[PDB]
Symmetry: C2
Subunit: 170 residues, 2 copies
């Protein structure tokens, strides 16, 4: 399934997000046109999987901001689940404040469009997508639920696509 | 496109390959069951682009072998084209001797099944795939042509999957 293809416009969408300041907002993918985007899905809120991945990405938000790349996280949980999890401090098992928006895909349409829905669980796989400043998909990464992604590898990829966009290697 | 899905058997195939020793052989994907496989595609033999990425995976072949993992490369070029490229010295643009088999996908079915075929060019994207020792597909990576992959990242992933197969997910006590 999915319309997500390398070299073609990433699937657009409008969805509820908890913004870093804790406020609900309607977020459109096409609103980030003019900057690279790291769009990564996680399965569920709370502790279905370890929250070290989502945290590592929030803490590197500034490494991505420095090279003009926005980072956005998404799951099928409600925007109300996201906020309850953010408003639970880290010292009591919660996420605490985040430096990236969390997107809600309760209709499962975004997961479906990006080819990352695990159909039997109704849950996204650990998908990560790199989208360029014109809205084109440059990179697809999907992992089975037990293994997390690498901030440092994602950073290598974004700088390498940015670099080759303005040069052309040898 | 494709039948490659996380949690399903990696799509099987039989194809001509140039083995490390220089001999042609009919290589079948399901023959690698009992071990992990890193299966990666590159676009084309003999480009002007340096084959750094392909050489780097060749030289890490041993590192993968030690942890119970085989590394296989593929493009839509013929095995005759692969052989010509290995027998071209690195100094004059060639590949030199290789420590991993180069699979030939002249029918483009493998590329199609793994969903990495760039239609307008008729070549593969830089897709890379991690298949477990039961032939189940664990990880999908697809880069646009300008950006290569990382041996080190591929090692982290292979080891990470092997570890979770035995122990389950790494999580700190409490719920991180
Ligand atoms: Ca669901
Ligand atoms: Ca984890
Ligand atoms: Ca021969
Ligand atoms: Ca093994
Ligand atoms: Ca073939």
């Amino acid at each position: 399934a999915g319309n997500a293809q390398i070299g073609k416009l990433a699937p657009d969408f409008t969805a509820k997000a908890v913004m870093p300041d804790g406020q609900f907002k309607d977020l459109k993918m096409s609103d980030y046109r003019g900057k690279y985007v790291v769009f990564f899905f996680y399965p569920l809120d709370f502790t279905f999987v370890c929250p070290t991945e989502i945290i590592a990405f929030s803490d590197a938000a500034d490494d991505f901001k420095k090279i003009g790349c926005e980072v956005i996280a998404a799951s099928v949980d409600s925007h109300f689940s996201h906020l309850a999890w953010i408003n639970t401090p880290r010292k009591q098992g919660g996420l605490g404040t985040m430096k990236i928006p969390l997107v809600s895909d309760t209709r499962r349409t975004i997961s479906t469009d990006y080819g990352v829905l695990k159909e039997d669980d109704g849950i996204a796989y650990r998908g990560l997508f790199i989208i360029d400043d014109k809205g084109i998909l440059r990179q697809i990464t999907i992992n089975d639920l037990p293994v997390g992604r690498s901030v440092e590898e994602t950073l290598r990829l974004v700088q390498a696509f940015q670099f080759t966009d303005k040069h052309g290697e040898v």
